[PDB]
């Protein structure tokens, strides 16, 4: 429930491990989190894991994402109290899109089901 830009300067590793803990507490798997994070940001799963041993901030992880996936614009709706598509701050908006993907995992979707939700075909 970190809502402000104070989030950007919190350490990546602790913040990301808390996402995983949420999913594991609800019977999901750490690997599913890595998979949806990789999909969203363009980071390889191994890249995400390497960041656990760095002192990079959560904000700087998102600022340096190699390739945001086009289908992420379809990640709409509410999370952490606010409408994702109406978030003005572009960095917070990507962060909240990850929170939405992780919410699906905490709610029992596999990463395959989450990707299938947002990948759009002609």
């Amino acid at each position: 429930n970190a809502m402000s830009q104070k989030l950007y300067n919190m350490k990546f590793a602790a913040v990301y491990l808390a996402l995983i803990a949420k999913v594991e507490r609800k019977g999901g798997k750490a690997e599913s989190v890595h998979q949806v994070t990789s999909w969203l940001t363009g980071y390889e799963v191994s890249d995400v894991l390497a960041c656990l041993d760095r002192d990079v901030t959560y904000g700087d992880f998102f600022r340096q994402a190699p390739y945001y996936v086009p289908e992420r614009i379809a990640i709409t709706g509410k999370i952490c109290g606010v409408r994702i598509e109406e978030i003005d701050d572009p960095l917070m908006q990507e962060i909240r899109r990850l929170d939405k993907l992780v919410d699906w995992l905490a709610k029992g979707k596999t990463s395959q089901q989450v990707l299938e939700k947002y990948e759009k075909h002609k």
Side-chain angles (χ1 to χ4, degrees), residues 2-122:
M3 315 284 268
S4 82
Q5 299 194 335
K6 292 178 190 173
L7 182 59
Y8 302 168
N9 303 316
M10 299 183 200
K11 299 297 183 18
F12 170 76
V15 179
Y16 187 73
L17 295 169
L19 288 182
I20 289 162
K22 290 153 191 158
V23 173
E24 290 192 342
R25 280 196 304 267
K26 303 305 183 182
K29 284 201 180 206
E31 193 60 30
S32 307
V33 179
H34 310 325
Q35 287 165 350
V36 305
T37 302
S38 178
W39 178 79
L40 173 67
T41 61
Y43 279 123
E44 294 308 315
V45 166
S46 56
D47 290 337
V48 176
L49 294 184
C51 292
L52 294 177
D53 190 47
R54 290 182 90 240
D55 282 298
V56 64
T57 66
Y58 203 59
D60 278 351
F61 179 84
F62 283 83
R63 293 179 182 106
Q64 295 173 295
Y67 206 101
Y68 279 102
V69 72
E71 288 77 9
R72 77 191 190 287
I73 301 313
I75 308 162
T76 58
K78 293 291 254 206
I79 205 61
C80 309
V82 294
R83 197 162 286 289
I84 289 153
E85 64 267 31
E86 288 173 10
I87 299 169
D88 274 343
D89 186 338
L91 180 59
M92 189 58 82
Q93 187 178 59
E94 304 303 3
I95 285 173
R96 292 297 186 239
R97 288 172 175 144
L98 183 61
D99 289 322
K100 187 63 152 177
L101 303 175
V102 172
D103 200 44
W104 288 115
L105 306 177
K107 261 138 240 223
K109 305 294 193 199
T110 64
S111 61
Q112 183 189 344
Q113 286 171 322
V114 174
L115 266 54
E116 282 182 18
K117 191 172 274 296
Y118 294 109
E119 279 187 323
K120 303 291 182 182
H121 307 300
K122 294 176 191 176

